[PDB]
Amino acid sequence: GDIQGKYLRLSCDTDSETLYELLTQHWHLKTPNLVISNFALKPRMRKIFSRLIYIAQSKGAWILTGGTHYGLMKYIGEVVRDNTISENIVAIGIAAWGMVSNRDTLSAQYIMYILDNNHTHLLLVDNGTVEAKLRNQLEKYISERTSQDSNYGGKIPIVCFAQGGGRETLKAINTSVKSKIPCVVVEQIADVIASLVTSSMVKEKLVRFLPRTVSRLPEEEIESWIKWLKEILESSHLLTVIKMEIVSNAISYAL
């Protein structure tokens, strides 16, 4: 159903090439750049993402997010709408169809999990997180694409952005870093990775940054998190950390 930009319901067992063909043939153009990202709306976080979206608009870059009205993604969608009101930005939210509070079959209309309407495009996964694999596969395939016009040598650049914590953030970072081409940028967990850049230091940083998340997590979960962080740090030459025109500088340095 077309929410009222575009909203589609694609099952988990979907071909990334088919999605790319659908998005490029008659929806959007080749992407010079592509980036994937209650919350603390601090001025630093309020300005860094504004600069990021301005850079994406300047370069015509795709932005990929979860696509929910609750969280920082709502702020991103609002900023996108404001800039469009002020050569169009492209934002894709990805979520699970079952995870949606309400489901409508269709051009159906959606009226207020709750999904934001600011994002231009939205995808729903029919599994019963279940969209991480699809997003990672799509990012890898796009990195596999060749665009001679792009200044980046050969393949289209891709950048991963980290701002918050949680097991989902670490899982996504580990999945992306498992792919050599993608590179990560760090804005709780962000402070952990910034401090780290063997087990004692990681444990101390994780405890200091997230007093409650570590407490709730079992010992096995903590060990798995430490393993993921060690794997991510082993490839530190890709990962970059921002020091607490800096967003563009950091992205360019990482690329």
Binding site: L8, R9, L10, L22, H26
Partner: peptide, 10 residues
């Protein structure tokens, strides 16, 4: 057109 393409995709 668009509906047929979407149906063929999934």
């Amino acid at each position: 057109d668009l509906v047929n393409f979407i149906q063929a995709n999934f």
